Design a protein around this nucleic acid. Structure first.
Ligand code: NA
Ligand code: NA
Lengths: 254, 255
DNA sequence: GCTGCGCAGG
DNA sequence: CCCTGGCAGC
């Protein structure tokens, strides 16, 4: 019976100033995966690097204040890999792959593609690189949990405004069609195992008070290889948890 | 009678959002000099590039959002130089030397030297290059007006806290001594021609609401060469004018 | 629009 | 600068 929370935090210091540690202590997950920490361990106060009861692992971007992932874990993994083995995907603080023996845990910050054609191309080629890696590990016989900010709403049910956003990154046909492809490779959007309601989102704009209106997008996911789905009991969204433009999401297994 | 205003604005777009053009048109100086505009002119609203009754000149830094000087003048100058002919000093949007025939106007944004040892070195060497340039012009017969953010308080009277800043850039012995040196070469701090009082500042920290308590430094100056000092009728601080960490300073000359 | 963080201001 | 005026997020 494990608890895992994934949160795209948008600044680990910012959330800290907002009461991250209290929230984390109230929630007591077995593993806490974070994305977009925008920080390297050296910029973090000692009480954030070292949380009583947890080993911490930070994978910052080469670029200061940019991107970065983190994992807190009551039980250390056996190993921790920080790349797909492709330099351009591996230096942006996007990838954590932790071996917990009963599964591999992918903690991924997938690229925003709305900036340019350059980055949308990078996002998609990142997607490609990820799929190879996850398939290679699954095909070798590992059960895999993937969580993080995928930066793509899968279906029209997954965002408040499906029609106006058909030409926007976050809901382009190429991106949606990569998630179809991913799922069709034997993986399961664990949230939609339990909940097929619309209005269920994980990200909202800061502008136009988008969160209060609930005009949002489901961008953050927990996926599992399908052979492992029986072991998942709960996959939910912690939508009342504030402090970032994303809310956290939760998974419970075995 | 000409009125020149000098203002280190810390963002021209920002001071624009706070009423700059209305203030500008009320003050109506013959020349307005601005430093630290933090803008290339392409980035500026149109009403900042085209001000009725003024030629405008923009000398941006290579670095985006950084430094930069501007000048608005009712009567255009015959030429405008944008450097001393030393490339590391000339790319940072710091220098405008405008030939107004009756005088040269130096609109200079002098470097902040408190970040690093490297930047303090740059500041003092920028000071050396400046003095050499103004001296050459002065020696050749030109009358010179120099306005801008010198980033140094000259004497104890030039800041609220002389004693605690004895070791801080803004008030280092090296920096104060350069101003001493500059003055010794034939140049006059014009505000001190008319006002010997303390508590006269042009810059204050945003932190601790220091402007509301007048806990400030006089970083912004109008200088002239000795030979031109009798032409200056007014040198004052526009300390009520809000919008930046600096306030504007003014000069009146009679030609 | 809005935000977090970088750099820089002095 | 505890305060303020590019890049990126989506
Ligand atoms: Na900002
Ligand atoms: Na800032």
């Amino acid at each position: 019976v494990l608890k895992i929370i994934s949160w795209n935090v948008n600044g680990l210091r910012a959330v800290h100033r907002k009461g991250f540690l209290k929230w984390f202590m109230e929630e007591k997950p077995d593993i806490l995966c974070l994305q977009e920490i925008k920080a390297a361990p050296e910029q973090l106060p000692r009480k954030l690097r070292h949380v009583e009861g947890y080993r911490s692992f930070f994978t910052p971007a080469e670029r200061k204040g940019y991107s970065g992932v983190a994992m807190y874990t009551k039980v250390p993994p056996s190993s921790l890999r920080e790349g797909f083995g492709v330099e351009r995907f591996d230096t942006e603080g996007r990838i954590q792959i932790a071996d917990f023996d009963d599964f591999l845990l992918y903690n991924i910050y997938f690229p925003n593609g709305k900036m340019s054609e350059e980055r949308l191309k990078y996002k998609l080629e990142f997607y490609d690189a990820f799929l190879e890696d996850v398939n290679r590990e699954r095909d070798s016989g590992r059960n895999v949990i993937i969580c993080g900010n995928f930066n793509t709403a899968h279906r029209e049910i997954d965002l408040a405004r499906p029609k106006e956003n058909s030409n926007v990154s976050g809901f382009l046909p190429v991106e949606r069609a990569w998630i179809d492809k991913f799922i069709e490779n034997g993986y399961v959007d664990t949230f939609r195992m339990f909940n097929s309601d619309p209005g269920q989102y994980t990200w909202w704009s800061y502008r136009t008070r988008a969160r209060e209106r609930n005009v949002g997008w489901r961008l953050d996911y927990f996926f599992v290889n399908e052979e492992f789905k029986g072991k998942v009991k709960r996959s939910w969204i912690l939508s009342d948890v504030m402090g970032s433009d994303h809310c956290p999401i939760g998974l419970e297994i075995e």
